[PDB]
Structures are given as structure tokens and as C-alpha cells.
Amino acid sequence: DVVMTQSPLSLPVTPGEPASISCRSSQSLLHSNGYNYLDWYLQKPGQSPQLLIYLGSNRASGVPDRFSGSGSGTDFTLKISRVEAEDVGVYYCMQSLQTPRLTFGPGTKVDIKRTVAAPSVFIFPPSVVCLLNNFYPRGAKVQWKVSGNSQESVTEQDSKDSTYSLSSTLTLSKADYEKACEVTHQGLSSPVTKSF
Amino acid sequence: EVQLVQSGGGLVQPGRSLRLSCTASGFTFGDYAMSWVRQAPGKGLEWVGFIRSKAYGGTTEYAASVKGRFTISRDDSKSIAYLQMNSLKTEDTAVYYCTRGGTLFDYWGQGTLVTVSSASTKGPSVFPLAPSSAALGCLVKDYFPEPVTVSWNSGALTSGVHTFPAVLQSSGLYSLSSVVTVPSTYICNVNHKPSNTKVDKKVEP
Amino acid sequence: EVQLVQSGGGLVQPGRSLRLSCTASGFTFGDYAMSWVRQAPGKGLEWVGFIRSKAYGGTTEYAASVKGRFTISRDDSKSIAYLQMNSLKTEDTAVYYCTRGGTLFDYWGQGTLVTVSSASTKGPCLVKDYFPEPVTVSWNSGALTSGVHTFPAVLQSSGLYSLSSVVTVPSTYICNVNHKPSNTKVDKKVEP
Amino acid sequence: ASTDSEKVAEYLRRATLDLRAARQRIRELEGEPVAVVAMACRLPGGVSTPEEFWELLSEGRDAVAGLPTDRGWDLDSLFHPDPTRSGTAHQRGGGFLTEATAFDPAFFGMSPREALAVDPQQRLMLELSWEVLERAGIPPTSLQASPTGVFVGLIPQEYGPRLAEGGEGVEGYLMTGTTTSVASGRIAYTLGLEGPAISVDTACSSSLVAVHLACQSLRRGESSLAMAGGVTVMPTPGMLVDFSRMNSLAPDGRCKAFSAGANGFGMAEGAGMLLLERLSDARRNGHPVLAVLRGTAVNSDGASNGLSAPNGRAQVRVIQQALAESGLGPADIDAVEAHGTGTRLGDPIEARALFEAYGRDREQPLHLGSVKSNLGHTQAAAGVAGVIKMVLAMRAGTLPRTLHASERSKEIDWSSGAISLLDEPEPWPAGARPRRAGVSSFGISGTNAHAIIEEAPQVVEGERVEAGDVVAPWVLSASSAEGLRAQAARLAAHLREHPGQDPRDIAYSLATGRAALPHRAAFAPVDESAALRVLDGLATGNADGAAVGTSRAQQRAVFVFPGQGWQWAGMAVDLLDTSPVFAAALRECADALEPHLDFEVIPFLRAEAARVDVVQPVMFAVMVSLASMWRAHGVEPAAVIGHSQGEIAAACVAGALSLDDAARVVALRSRVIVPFFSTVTGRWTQPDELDAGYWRFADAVRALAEQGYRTFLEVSAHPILTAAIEEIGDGSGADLSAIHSLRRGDGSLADFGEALSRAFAAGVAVDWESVHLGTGARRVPLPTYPFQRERVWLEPLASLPAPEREKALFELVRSHAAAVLGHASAERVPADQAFAELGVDSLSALELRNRLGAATGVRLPTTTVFDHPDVRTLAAHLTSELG
Amino acid sequence: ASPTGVFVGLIPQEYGPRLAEGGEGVEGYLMTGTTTSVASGRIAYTLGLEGPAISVDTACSSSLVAVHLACQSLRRGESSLAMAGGVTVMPTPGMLV
Amino acid sequence: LAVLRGTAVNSDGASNGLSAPNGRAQVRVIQQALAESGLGPADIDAVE
């Protein structure tokens, strides 16, 4: 009754070649009638969700032929043919054995594959900020200590280049300052610090 | 063809009441069963309620954090679904969707904002700086509501702009930031039509 | 891709036993449910029985007029269904069909014919008192092929079917018969 | 949710919906019907329009006159007492087109020397395509870079001298004028289409094969618009000489189908053309629908007895295939247009095949008729002509007659009675049973085809009408003054023939459906009789009550913002009270006046009801409202300039400040008492730099003219300082034309109408759709273009003394240009015209360059023609290369 | 009498004398032996095939156009077999002049 | 011997001359043929 996608949550893609998303489940469904009660959904950025494939692999009308499901009752996996533009968003695995479904699930993101370009680090002395630039793949750790209160934001996947940019702000109110800012990236070595 | 539209939504203080209208056309509305889903602003999708069909009669079941809070309503003369609001809470601020089907979520609606807060339109602050270099920064703080526009050099330079999305402050206000580049005469301009405020600021390093 | 190729039948004396086999092919035989339908000669259709799929168990409903006279068994290793004829009683003779599906009758396979009762060959223009089952006519030694009106056989009090054939002309006619098990050609002419 | 009780229901519903959608897609893909939109034809006799063809069919005449004389045929040794003598024909007549000799090369871009080498077939096809495009209502210039397939059926034949011997003037163009491949390539190149272009030759069934291929291409979705037809024009009597050898030609040359006096099939010539589109797309765009094609079939006779003799089994099979493809039963056809070749042996075979296909199971007697009795055999032009006749007669609800059919052939059985000859006209009224018909065409190669035609759906009914008061302008364009006069005369005559028309309908029809040719004339009518007088005046050649102007490659306009001058401002009535845009363009600016003046739309009316501090805000409001009205009516400026008080309006229209916010921010004190030219600085400036600190007319206008804009729209209630602008325009460069928006004392919308007419006459692009957003007007048929044809036919140094040197150079350049292009009248070529429209190509370009280099002894770049597309530009460049 | 399509690409060329000046031996076969439409008809008549026989002329891409048409006809299913090809022969040196 | 996938036919349109080839049209022909064949540009090794 518990299903998690178990597929790469990021899953970078590049057009031309195909891809796939695995979907591992708990004990198999295999309803006595002879079907698997598993569905797929796709969410475009800023769009309403739409259905792709219901039980088994019988993708509904309107859906392009490039999509095709498959899998047994406990090893469902969705195959996508040659990758094109868009199709970037969140994909959801949906079960049907338990009617009172609460949450669709974390889902798996999809984005265009790129290189491991390193980030950049800047500081802004005075209520101060620590921002970066072009640190694909997405990911950054902020551990202001000089911790507990912070506030950050992240933009989209940099359509023209696909290199995310981030900005985080130190939460302070007034002249209570009497006296750390480093970020670790997987495409980067030991973090660098400015510290005002 | 089959069209679904939603109406009813806006700013309401905590403890108010409201209703939402879902309109269906192009199919026999009697057979299908309506369901309402809600997506938090920056989180996943969580099911809210589900009303059965008169063929089986029946009613809804709702879920946790919504049971006993507000109810549903469904008609048949004009196929208009109604979702009631009772004692709205700030955490309920999220987009709402109305879609066909009770188990297989078929063709969806379009969504409605429906925000809950207790504040008033304010004037943004600026507090800008250029410490050494270059992504020049002119933040915007303490403004309400969300709609706001910013630009650089009175909307002249638009190459590399990295304006970041809004974030809710603990006081109910919002804070912004905007940096572009200068790897070397630059003025930051922001407008807040809801508060009808014009602010242009020059920043030096 | 889907055939049932049922087989197994013949002539059986009253108070005996027999069996029939329906052979699945192509589709997954496990999920579907089998059924048997019998059509009496010169009649409509009637339902015999069916067996549920393993997902719902092995329940078998024998309708009526049988009540344990016959039994239906299902095999999944070779995907073969069996109907066990037992204690046949006269009117049970018909052509039997094996169909796929419990309620909605699918591809329907094909039928097989069985007979009943005990008698012997007798030999036969009335062409009366024969019981192989088939009879052929060679009108005018196969020369005259016009105005033929051969009619189907008719059951009598003690079997021993009878036939009929006639031609007309307002104006040299042998009629004649053939009998496969006995070869009792009689030919002969007629003048009224 | 009840398990296994409701969940399966949703899945079943979804599966049923998907299955229904898939089956609908299959059905649509396999057999979607195609609709017929337009009509074009050129038939023997006096036929030039389909209506004339229908008239001829109704009166029941024949177009057999005799051999022509313009083509220079010998016409004497073509016959002899001995029929076996070489070079002797048999036919002493037939229907021949009399317009094959004439052509209009100037309308398209083609040099006369090149035009002299063009085959008559592709020569006629261009005119047919243009007419069929104009008739459907689609402007010819609209279809650019769009999928539009072209299919033509032709026969090679021979036109001019052999390639090996060559010619004198036409040497490098003998190929492109005397081949079959270019028959569609030329049309595609002229119209700029991008659909497939195919030329197919299958003897007498070429047109039917072409329409079948077009239908298949439309069904597959490869192209969204199709165009098919056939043509056959012979310039040499060799065809008759050859066909006389096997003695298959009747002496007189008349086709007697199914008659007792069969002698031959004669000969004739003609052309036809159709436009096709699938029914759904035609319905969506509102294109006219005449009839619907359902199914066709193509087959060959196979191993027939000999080569020429046909077979009946193939005909029966193809008929059955055509009937089964469209799913129409054999007892659902009312009439059939047979081949009707009239030969001795073909007629019994065709009759027996028709009896087998239809007459075996018939309840009502089938009606049979042949069009070749009226015209004779037209080779590839056949087939399509039969479809044209069928659709015309079936629209008119009357079956035409058949000539020389009073004596049925004895060799053909008629005892069945299921087939009735059309010896007399038969009414064909509409009824519950949809009307249908079928056509056939058999060639000498062996290929044969059949088709089924059905009546248009009865859904056009339901039109509403509504009166009105706004008068719409009338416009018309041509390619020359004579063309303009002829077009005006034709329009006047057609209007006289058919009275009771609606001025709105005619204005709507003329607004959309005609190209923007560089010879324009427009006006505004008040009566169906006064417009007739105006058209008669235009035909005579005097411009009275109408605006006439000639302009090519001039389409951009510029607004000019003056200061004061129209202080009467009496046009506060209507406009903002009647015109929706002017109404919506006044209050928001008036709302901006509330902060410090409380001056809304109503107090403007109350102030007038019949001090610059209050005139200036209303002046700004009038400026912005008129600018909004103009920009909404399709005309947008390329630049704007302002007077001392016009810079505020210039900033408002340039986006320097918001629509209403510009008003009371520049006027925060409120009385002080688009790429545009900054009048204070005399240069182009961006809207951003305008601020509070911001708050040579000849030089500005001359610079703007140098930039490439040659007109100005004076937005004001009265024309002010326009004469100075005109005078400065005359003194530098080309003529500079300006038009006022409105004139003091005339607040009627007719003033705006005539202003729009003048703007159109000035070459300003106008969006007629905004003018006709909705009035209750629909399309009405109109006459086509009046071409101006002429006969074409082949048969088998000073040392800078003065600017007078510049005129000498210009004259010699003109003479050389006339010489190279083959213009026999070396008296005049257009001056402002470029070279791309004169028909000069690379072959002529290098010859002209060599001639010029030899004439003046200077070195000239090869690509100079690209550098100087105009003769004037080349003359100016060469006159500056002295010393 | 089998469904079989023929598609041939051709460019018309002159071979003998003009029709108006027919020679001694050949008088009535002049046009039958030169028209491009009969090119496929000859094959369809000698082999007895009963299918669409079309001659297509589209300059240097005639063979490819014919192949495409044959492929479409086969896909639609109106014929069970097809033949496609092109040919070009220069009988007189007026071409390269 | 081999298998054909799909073909495409198109016209040059309005070029600078009747015999002047058009550039962008051929791109459309190739793209339409590839799309009809249901393949990608990376699946072709040689071109004649």
C-alpha cells in the first residue's frame, strides 16, 4: 500500500535519445480480474495536471505515441521514446487499491542535461544576502554560522543555458550585529567562505 | 467539447466564508463524480474531497484537517458543483482544482488562487548596495500584495537579469531581489501599481 | 490466433458415458471462463453449463435438466476443458458447442455432433428403412441434374429414417439410391 | 468508494471513449469527402465563363465552325481526292479556341522575348489559375509559403522550331517554354506556393487522374489546399494528319454518341480547372461550397484485343470499385455522363458495360447524356468538362439536352428500358433523396477512371440581415490605366444587369478578394444610381468625386502632431458618442484629467454645448483618441513628430509614459500658465529619455523622406500648415503627399470614409477586417480581371558638357534596356519600376552589362543589377563614375 | 488480370520527322511511338497487368516522384504490387545546344 | 533486399529565379521526410 518512485529524482535528459522512469511498489496488485491498478500523471510547469496512462499500458487519446508504459504488478516502469522539447516537469505514480488517497507523492523531476559547471560566490554587507550563479546540476548547502533562521529562493532552470541561480538572505532585524557563508556543490570542491 | 471552468476566489481574512463554483459542459454530468484537489504554493498535490453520483446516491468523505471544516454541494439542473468555505485558515492559502472522476482523475479544470491573509497594501523599501562588484543588487522588502514589477536603467538593460521569485516574510510581507551583471551609471527602478508607487534608485560601488 | 478445435464424439447406446475436449490456443486460457451450448436438430439453442475462472474459484453451474448427469472439468497445464457425458438418454442427441466467456459469448469456437440409441443397418422412390445416418442419390445414374428436390430425412417411431425425391415433366427415369455401409443400389424404373 | 462496483465503470467509460475516437479517426482518414470551391473554364465557341457554358447547354447549340486561320496553317494541301496521299487530313471542321493567339505578358513579370517562346498551354493555365483564385474570394497574394498542391494533365505536342537548329531572339528559352514539367512549376513560381507540383500525361483521362491524385493528397493531409485541371491546345495540323491515316476521324467532325450515323470522334480543344478542399476545413473558414466529391477509382484495361480497342470487364470493375469505395449503392445514381466518343465500336461496348453495372438492378430509368455532342472530343480537356457540366446542371436543377440523338443505334439493345437517352430536358428538383451523378473517361493508352459527385449539404440556409447607416468605401485596383477603365466599365455593366444589390454586400466583396495592385481608385457611394454615374465617369477617364493615385512599394505612413489651429473642435458630437474605439479612447484620458481639472468626457460636451489651460487637455484627448482610432483601423505609423505642444502626444504614442498617466504627469502643474523624430533636437530618440527637463520643419521632413517614408497623415479636425509640407516635399526628392483626417464644418462619418479612401489611394495599408468587423454583409459574385491581350506567335564621346549628358545617358540606357528585353516598341519602359518585374534574368543581365561596357568603355561589376534595381539608380551611379 | 501498378518518369524528346511530314514506311504509328502516356501502357498491355498505369514528368526528380506515388498507392492498398523507374535517352544533339 | 520508410515532396516556391534553387525549402523537405519516417537526425549514417 506504500509506493515510491525509486527513479532518479532529477533524471537529466537530452533530446534525441530515449529514457525511462522506474516505479517500484510494495506487494503486487494483480486484482483478480487480471489487471494492475496503476496510473501515470504528468504536470507541466505552471499548467493543470493531465492523465497519461491508466491501468497497465493503454495510454489514452490525445497523448502522443512517444509514451508507452510496461511492467508487471510490482515492477512498473514507463518507457519514453526519442526525447523532444518540453516534457519537463513532475511525473507521478498512482495506485488504486486504496481509495482514500491523500497525497500523489514527491514525484520525479525532469530537466535538460548539462555539464558540471562550478558555481560562483558573492557576499553583500549591510539583513544581508549570499547569492550564487550558474551551478548546474541543482544543489547548494548554506550553513551560516558566524544558524537556525534563514530564507532563500531559486529561479528556474535557466532556459537559455540550464544553469540554476540562487539567492539566500540572512534573517536579521536591526543593529544587533557585533563581530560565515559557504556553499558546497557536487560539481565543486571544498566550499569557499567570505564572512563579511 | 468538454470544458470545465472554476469561479470564486480572492483575499479573505481568517474566519470568513466562501463558495466555489465548478461549471461543466459537453457531457452528461449526472453519471460522473466530482472531486476537488488542492496544491500548496510550493509543495505537492493533496486530495481534498470527492462527491459520488446520484446513481449510487451517496455523499463525500473529506479527509483530515478538512472534516467538519467545510462541506460540498452539487446540483443537477445546470451541472454546477459547489465547495463551501467555513472559518478559512491562513495555511489553506493554495490553488484549488476541480476535476472529473472519483478514482481515475480525468480531464481537469483551470485552477483558482484563493488567498487568505490579514494585511493591507504597503510601500516597498529599497536598502540597495554595491559592495565591490558583478550582479548589482537592489532588493525590495516590505511590500503587499504580490504584484510588483522591477527593471534596470529604467528598463534599458535586460541581458542576464536574475530576478528571484517572491517569498513570504514572517510578518506577512514579501521580499525581492534583482541582480544582472556589470564587469566594468546604473539605476534600479521598481513599480508597485497595487500601491501605485514609483521608486527609482541610483547605486554606486 | 484463437481457435478451440474441439473434438470427441460419436454414436453411443443409451445408458453410457462419453467425454469431449475443448483445446485453447493463443490467448491466456487461465483468465477466461468456458461454457457449453447445445443445439438440438431442428431447434433453437439451449445453455448447458459453465465453469468460473480460478480467480473466483472453481464454481460450476449446471443449469437444469442435468443435475449431475454431466460434469465439466478444467485443465490449465494444457489449457483443455472437458465435458463428461454420462447416462445419455435419447433426446440428449444434438450438436454441442464450446464457447469462451461467462456472460458475453466470444469467438465461440466450433461445434461437434453426437448421436444416441441402438439399431443396425437395414438398407433402403420412398427410400425408407435405413440407419447409417447419411444417404445419397444418383438420379438417372448421374445423368439428369434438373428438377431435383431431395428432402432431408425425418425421424420415425423406431428411427430407420426415410427420404423423398421427385421430378416433373409434362412429356427413362431411374431415381436410384446409394447406401454407404451396405451398397444396396436398386435403380429401377416407374410408370404410373 | 465501493470496490469493483464503481472503479471499473470509469475505466469502461474511458475505454469506450477511446475506441469511439479511434474508429472516428479511421473513418475520417479513409473516406473524408472533399468539397469543390471555385470554377474556371475556357471552351470552344464564345465560352469564357462557366455561366456562359451553362447558357450554351441550356439553349442546346454546337460550337463547330471550322479550321482557324491565325496559326498560319497551309489550309490548302491538307486535303485531296486521294485519302492516302501524304500530308492529307480528313476533318473539315471542329471547335477551336480563337483566343490562343493572344496573350498579356506585361501583367506577369516576363520579358516579351521570353514570352514569345511560351507554349500556349501553360500560357492559358496562368490565366485560368488567376481567375479561379479570384472567383473563390481568396486574394491571390495571400497564399504565400503555404501548402497548395498543383496537378495538371497535358499532352506534349510541339510548338516551335526544333531545338538543334535554334533561333535568333529565342535561344536560351526554348526549353522552359516547350516542356511539360514546367506546366505547374511556372504557376508555383508565380504564386509562391509550396505544395507539390506534378505534371501527368495519361492521354484523354489526364484530368480525371489529376483530380484523383489531388483528392488522395488532400485526404492524406499532405496539403491543405489543392488545384487540378487539364488543358489541350494544338498549334500544328500534324495531329489531324496522323489521325487521318488509320481513318478514325469523321469527315464533318461532329460526335454523334449512341447514334446510328457514327463516323468518328472529330477533334476540339479547351481547358478547365478546379479548386478542392476537404469539407471540414472549408466549413471552418466559411469558403463557398458548390458540390462534394466522394470517391474515385483508376484502372487499366490490361491485355486488351490489340492496343487501341478497349475492354468492358475493366470498365465494369472500375465502376464497381468507385461505387464501393464511397459506399453508394448502384441504385442511387440519377444520371451518368458517359464517354460518348461516338466511334463505331466503342459505343456498343460502353452501352453493354453500363447496362451490366447499373441497368441489371434498376427501379427508375437512368438518364444518359454526353457533353461531347455539343463540343466534340477535347482530348485531355475532357473529363473535367463533364464534371463542370454535371455540377452546373445539378445546381440549376435541370438536365440539359443531347444533340443528334434522335436515332438510337441499332447495334445497342434498348429492350431493358432501364437506361433513357436525354433527348429532351428533364427537371431535376431537389427532394428527400440526395442527387448524385457519375462521370467516366477512357483513353487510348488503356487507363480509365470514374468518379461520383454529390450535391452540397443544405445548411447554408439560416442567414440573417440587418440594416445600417455607416457607408463603406468602394475600392478597385488594376495594373494599368486601361485596365482600370475596363474594370470600371465591366463593374458598371454588371451592376446594371443585376439590380437590387446591397451596397454593403458589394463593398464587402470588393474589400476582400482582390489584390493590392499599383493602380488604385476609391470613393464613397450614396445611391445605387449615383455610384453608377461615378463609375461611368471613371470609365470615361475623369476623376470626379473619387480619389485616384498611383503608388508602388509605398505602404508605410507617418502621423504628424501639430499645435493649435482647429480650435472650433465642433466634432465633439458622434465619434466618442458613436465610434466604439473613439468612445473607448476618450474617457481614460479624461479620467487622467480628474486629478486637477475634474474634466471628463461629458464636460467636454457641456463646455462646447454648441483659455489654453483647458484647450490643451482636450487637444491631447482628441490627439490620443484619433491616434487610437487610426491604429485600430489597421494603419500604424513608421514615425511621429510633434509641434510645440505635439511632443506630449508623441511621447504618449511612443510609450514614453503610460496611456493616461502621461496626461497628468507632464501636466502635473496642468497649465504651466515607436521610433520618432525628436523635433527639438532633429534626430530619432528613444521614449525612455523623455522626462521633465524635456518639457527646421523642412529639415525634419526631408530627412524622413530620405529615410524611406513618403507620406504623412495629418491628425486634426482641420488641415493646418499642409501646403508648406507639400512645398518642401516638391523641393527635395519625390513628391510628398499628406492627407488631413477631418475638415472643419464636416463632422459626419462620411468625412472619415473619404479620408480612408484617400489614404488607400495613397498606398497606405488598411485592415479592411476592422472596417467590416460586423455589419451583416456577405460575399457576392463579381466579374474577374479584364486582361489586355496582344498577338504573340512563332512560326516553324562627350566630356561632361552639361547635365544634358545625363539625359543622354538616361536615353541610351532606356534604348539598351528596350533592346535587350525584346520590346519591339523601343519608346518607353517604366521608370520607377525595378528590374525583377521586367523579366530580365542572368542571360540578359550579362548581355546588358557587356553592351553597356562596350558603349562607354568602362568596367562594370557583374552584380550591379542587384545594387541598382532601378534604371534611374543605374543612371545616377553611372553618371557619377565620370572622371 | 492482377492488380499491379506501373509508374515511369520521362522527359519528352523528338525522335523522327514531324507528324505533318510522315514518311513512307511509318504513317499511322508516329504518335503512338512518341507520346509519353503510352510508355506505361505498352508494358501494361504486353504483360496484361490490370492496375493504374501513369506516366509522370517532373524534370530530374521524376523517378523519385514516381517511387513516392507507388509507395503511397501500395500503402493505401489499392494494388498488391508496383513498379517504378525512370529513363532518359538523347536521340538528337539539340539538348546540349 | 531493403526497406523504405517514408518520402516527402515539396516545391521551391518564389525564389530569385525560375532555375534558382531555394535554400530553406530543402530543410523543410528533409524534416518532413524524417518526421514521417518517425526517426531522428542522429539515426542516419550516410547521405547520397
PDB file of N, CA and C in Angstrom, chain E residues 22-49:
ATOM      1  N   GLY E  22       4.869  12.862 -92.477  1.00  0.00           N
ATOM      2  CA  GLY E  22       5.108  11.455 -92.202  1.00  0.00           C
ATOM      3  C   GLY E  22       5.767  10.758 -93.380  1.00  0.00           C
ATOM      4  N   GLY E  23       6.636   9.803 -93.066  1.00  0.00           N
ATOM      5  CA  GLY E  23       7.404   9.101 -94.070  1.00  0.00           C
ATOM      6  C   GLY E  23       6.605   8.009 -94.755  1.00  0.00           C
ATOM      7  N   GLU E  24       7.326   7.196 -95.527  1.00  0.00           N
ATOM      8  CA  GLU E  24       6.690   6.148 -96.316  1.00  0.00           C
ATOM      9  C   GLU E  24       6.312   4.949 -95.454  1.00  0.00           C
ATOM     10  N   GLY E  25       7.303   4.320 -94.820  1.00  0.00           N
ATOM     11  CA  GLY E  25       7.037   3.102 -94.075  1.00  0.00           C
ATOM     12  C   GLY E  25       6.137   3.321 -92.874  1.00  0.00           C
ATOM     13  N   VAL E  26       6.384   4.382 -92.116  1.00  0.00           N
ATOM     14  CA  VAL E  26       5.636   4.674 -90.900  1.00  0.00           C
ATOM     15  C   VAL E  26       4.755   5.888 -91.163  1.00  0.00           C
ATOM     16  N   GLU E  27       3.442   5.683 -91.115  1.00  0.00           N
ATOM     17  CA  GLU E  27       2.482   6.769 -91.257  1.00  0.00           C
ATOM     18  C   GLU E  27       1.578   6.921 -90.046  1.00  0.00           C
ATOM     19  N   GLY E  28       0.923   5.843 -89.615  1.00  0.00           N
ATOM     20  CA  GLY E  28      -0.029   5.916 -88.528  1.00  0.00           C
ATOM     21  C   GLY E  28       0.513   5.613 -87.155  1.00  0.00           C
ATOM     22  N   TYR E  29       1.755   5.147 -87.063  1.00  0.00           N
ATOM     23  CA  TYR E  29       2.361   4.795 -85.789  1.00  0.00           C
ATOM     24  C   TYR E  29       3.269   5.890 -85.248  1.00  0.00           C
ATOM     25  N   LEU E  30       3.268   7.070 -85.870  1.00  0.00           N
ATOM     26  CA  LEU E  30       4.172   8.131 -85.438  1.00  0.00           C
ATOM     27  C   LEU E  30       3.829   8.617 -84.035  1.00  0.00           C
ATOM     28  N   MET E  31       2.563   8.962 -83.800  1.00  0.00           N
ATOM     29  CA  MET E  31       2.183   9.488 -82.494  1.00  0.00           C
ATOM     30  C   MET E  31       2.104   8.384 -81.448  1.00  0.00           C
ATOM     31  N   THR E  32       1.759   7.162 -81.855  1.00  0.00           N
ATOM     32  CA  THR E  32       1.723   6.051 -80.913  1.00  0.00           C
ATOM     33  C   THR E  32       3.099   5.719 -80.355  1.00  0.00           C
ATOM     34  N   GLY E  33       4.159   5.955 -81.121  1.00  0.00           N
ATOM     35  CA  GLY E  33       5.504   5.633 -80.705  1.00  0.00           C
ATOM     36  C   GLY E  33       6.294   6.764 -80.092  1.00  0.00           C
ATOM     37  N   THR E  34       5.669   7.909 -79.831  1.00  0.00           N
ATOM     38  CA  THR E  34       6.371   9.054 -79.267  1.00  0.00           C
ATOM     39  C   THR E  34       5.693   9.673 -78.055  1.00  0.00           C
ATOM     40  N   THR E  35       4.380   9.532 -77.899  1.00  0.00           N
ATOM     41  CA  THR E  35       3.703  10.110 -76.747  1.00  0.00           C
ATOM     42  C   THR E  35       4.166   9.433 -75.463  1.00  0.00           C
ATOM     43  N   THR E  36       4.336  10.234 -74.411  1.00  0.00           N
ATOM     44  CA  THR E  36       4.841   9.708 -73.149  1.00  0.00           C
ATOM     45  C   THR E  36       3.798   8.897 -72.392  1.00  0.00           C
ATOM     46  N   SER E  37       2.509   9.126 -72.652  1.00  0.00           N
ATOM     47  CA  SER E  37       1.474   8.404 -71.922  1.00  0.00           C
ATOM     48  C   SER E  37       1.511   6.915 -72.234  1.00  0.00           C
ATOM     49  N   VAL E  38       1.813   6.559 -73.485  1.00  0.00           N
ATOM     50  CA  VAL E  38       1.807   5.161 -73.895  1.00  0.00           C
ATOM     51  C   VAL E  38       2.992   4.377 -73.355  1.00  0.00           C
ATOM     52  N   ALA E  39       3.954   5.045 -72.711  1.00  0.00           N
ATOM     53  CA  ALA E  39       5.138   4.345 -72.224  1.00  0.00           C
ATOM     54  C   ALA E  39       4.773   3.268 -71.210  1.00  0.00           C
ATOM     55  N   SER E  40       3.913   3.596 -70.249  1.00  0.00           N
ATOM     56  CA  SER E  40       3.433   2.598 -69.303  1.00  0.00           C
ATOM     57  C   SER E  40       2.356   1.705 -69.899  1.00  0.00           C
ATOM     58  N   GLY E  41       1.568   2.237 -70.833  1.00  0.00           N
ATOM     59  CA  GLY E  41       0.525   1.440 -71.451  1.00  0.00           C
ATOM     60  C   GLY E  41       1.076   0.260 -72.227  1.00  0.00           C
ATOM     61  N   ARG E  42       2.222   0.446 -72.882  1.00  0.00           N
ATOM     62  CA  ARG E  42       2.835  -0.653 -73.621  1.00  0.00           C
ATOM     63  C   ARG E  42       3.178  -1.809 -72.693  1.00  0.00           C
ATOM     64  N   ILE E  43       3.787  -1.505 -71.546  1.00  0.00           N
ATOM     65  CA  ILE E  43       4.135  -2.553 -70.592  1.00  0.00           C
ATOM     66  C   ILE E  43       2.875  -3.208 -70.046  1.00  0.00           C
ATOM     67  N   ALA E  44       1.899  -2.391 -69.642  1.00  0.00           N
ATOM     68  CA  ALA E  44       0.676  -2.934 -69.065  1.00  0.00           C
ATOM     69  C   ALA E  44      -0.099  -3.788 -70.056  1.00  0.00           C
ATOM     70  N   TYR E  45       0.023  -3.507 -71.351  1.00  0.00           N
ATOM     71  CA  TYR E  45      -0.676  -4.270 -72.373  1.00  0.00           C
ATOM     72  C   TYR E  45       0.080  -5.531 -72.763  1.00  0.00           C
ATOM     73  N   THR E  46       1.411  -5.462 -72.840  1.00  0.00           N
ATOM     74  CA  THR E  46       2.185  -6.658 -73.154  1.00  0.00           C
ATOM     75  C   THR E  46       2.118  -7.675 -72.024  1.00  0.00           C
ATOM     76  N   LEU E  47       2.228  -7.223 -70.775  1.00  0.00           N
ATOM     77  CA  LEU E  47       2.195  -8.143 -69.647  1.00  0.00           C
ATOM     78  C   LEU E  47       0.790  -8.404 -69.124  1.00  0.00           C
ATOM     79  N   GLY E  48      -0.213  -7.681 -69.611  1.00  0.00           N
ATOM     80  CA  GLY E  48      -1.579  -7.938 -69.205  1.00  0.00           C
ATOM     81  C   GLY E  48      -1.933  -7.498 -67.805  1.00  0.00           C
ATOM     82  N   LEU E  49      -1.110  -6.662 -67.180  1.00  0.00           N
ATOM     83  CA  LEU E  49      -1.402  -6.197 -65.833  1.00  0.00           C
ATOM     84  C   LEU E  49      -2.630  -5.297 -65.833  1.00  0.00           C
TER      85      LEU E  49
END
